[PDB]
Ligand binder design. Structure first.
Ligand SMILES: O=C(O)CCC(=O)C(=O)O
Ligand code: NI
Lengths: 68, 329, 11
């Protein structure tokens, strides 16, 4: 129930599909990431939930990802 | 070079209008959300961009003292477009050498000066800071840990591609290319000027570009003449130029010039960023000319999105604690 | 001869 842009929704989908489809020797899962499979699963759930984002309400003027 | 570069600078056939002319105050996050940063942008003045640059009469020698006289710098041989290396003192001597006494044409486009005294004298556009993956996705304690001011990969703790100094003598030319990893680029003409040829990242143009890379006939062919529409545009002193992901471009330097610019990935043009990475893969671009830790970064991007939206972390406990320590500062 | 990354150059 935050509203993302379609740019982000399509991009994150592209990212998920890309990363999931790489072989283990090309995946480059970084040291900081715990369980990449659980991460991928959570992204897919999120993209389903965010699919109905309203395009106008998405134009908040500040990014969703910001440091505290 | 098997083509005549001077006729490419004079002809009126590169008459496409791809570049949007914009005011700095309108280049904000809402603009990115609305447009996805798909259009090349020129800001004829810096008002509202939030940039900062060095002393207007800053010299290559001043750059040398900031980054270190003995720092090895990657230099381009303009005639072959191959890379050579020399120290910053030697580069400075070259730049200070009278034109007539320089037996070769050399260009520096790749001096990344983060973690030197020069870094605080250059501030990127504010909007770039809001959207750049390095600043907003890469673990902060890793980025803050960087001590090495060179781009030595074994010492590199994050993708060190944010702040570059370009030093180009009259007559320099950089042939058509797409910036690494499909990064977008900002470019500020501190002193001098530049001429760009721009080719849009259509499926067909990207196919041609890739075939051109694989053909071994690149010095032999001017890519601007192989495509349907190409824009040649001049950037004057004080202009800021933003180039979107995937844009195929070449650059000529009509006078001695000093430029500050940098690369960034962002969340609003991911498909094109990945497209470009795959072209690099297929054309066997060596690792050194690519965006460092590209897929690592992509992983961190997914984690950040899940965390900011759902409050569920996919970082290790130790990385979460490092992040909380940063938050308490 | 340390390996480098993020060198900007046409390929
Ligand atoms: O200014 C130049 O010669 C080249 C700029 C550029 O497009 C690059 O270095 O990636
Ligand atoms: Ni470039």
């Amino acid at each position: 129930q935050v509203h993302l842009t379609h740019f982000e929704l399509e991009g994150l989908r592209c990212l998920v599909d890309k990363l999931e489809s790489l072989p283990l020797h090309k995946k480059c899962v970084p040291t900081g990431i715990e369980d990449e499979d659980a991460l991928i699963a959570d992204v897919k759930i999120l993209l389903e939930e965010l699919a109905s984002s309203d395009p106008k309400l998405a134009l908040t003027g500040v990014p969703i990802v910001q440091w505290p | 070079r098997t083509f005549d570069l001077e006729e490419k600078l004079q002809t009126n056939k590169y008459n496409a209008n791809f570049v949007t002319f914009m005011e700095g105050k309108d280049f904000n996050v809402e603009y990115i959300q609305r447009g996805g940063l798909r259009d090349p942008l020129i800001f004829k003045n810096s008002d509202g961009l939030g940039i900062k640059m060095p002393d207007p009469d800053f010299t290559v020698n001043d750059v040398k003292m900031c980054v270190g006289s003995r720092r090895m710098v990657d230099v381009m041989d303009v005639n072959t477009q191959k890379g050579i290396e020399m120290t910053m003192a030697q580069w400075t001597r070259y730049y200070e050498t009278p034109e007539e006494e320089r037996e070769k044409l050399y260009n520096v486009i790749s001096l990344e000066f983060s973690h030197t005294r020069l870094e605080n004298m250059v501030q990127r556009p504010s909007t770039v800071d809001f959207i750049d993956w390095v600043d907003n996705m890469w673990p902060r304690h890793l980025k803050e840990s960087q001590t090495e001011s060179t781009n030595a990969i074994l010492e590199m703790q994050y993708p060190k591609v944010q702040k570059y100094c370009l030093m180009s003598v009259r007559g320099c030319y950089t042939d058509f290319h797409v910036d690494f990893g499909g990064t977008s680029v900002w470019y500020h003409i501190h002193q001098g000027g530049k001429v760009f040829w721009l080719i849009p990242p259509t499926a067909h143009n990207l196919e041609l570009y890739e075939n051109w890379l694989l053909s071994g006939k690149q010095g032999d062919i001017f890519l601007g003449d192989r495509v349907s529409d190409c824009q040649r545009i001049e950037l004057k002193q004080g202009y800021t130029f933003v180039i979107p992901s995937g844009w195929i471009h070449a650059v000529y330097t009509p006078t001695d010039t000093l430029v500050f610019g940098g690369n960034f990935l962002h969340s609003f043009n991911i498909p094109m960023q990945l497209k470009i990475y795959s072209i690099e893969d297929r054309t066997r671009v060596p690792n050194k000319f690519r965006y460092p830790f590209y897929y690592e970064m992509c992983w961190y991007v997914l984690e950040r999105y899940v965390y900011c939206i759902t409050n569920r972390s996919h970082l290790t406990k130790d990385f979460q604690k490092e992040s909380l320590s940063m938050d308490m500062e | 001869a340390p390996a480098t990354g993020g060198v900007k150059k046409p390929h």
